Amino acid sequence: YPIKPEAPGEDASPEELNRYYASLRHYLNLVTRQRY
């Protein structure tokens, strides 16, 4: 459960949704790796 990934609006589209997507993967990864 990501508290603050990125989150778009309602326009989404395969670029913004994909951006927030990998930002969620970024967020989720770093959230499990709080190493400095």
Swiss-Prot record:
Chain positions found as Tyrosine amide: Y36
Coiled coil (UniProt feature): none
Site residues, Cleavage: P2, I3
Protein's UniProt name: Peptide YY
Membrane-spanning parts: none
Domain of life: Eukaryota
Modification Phosphoserine, positions: S13
Annotated source species: Homo sapiens
Originating gene: PYY
Shown stretch of the complete protein: 29 to 64 of 97
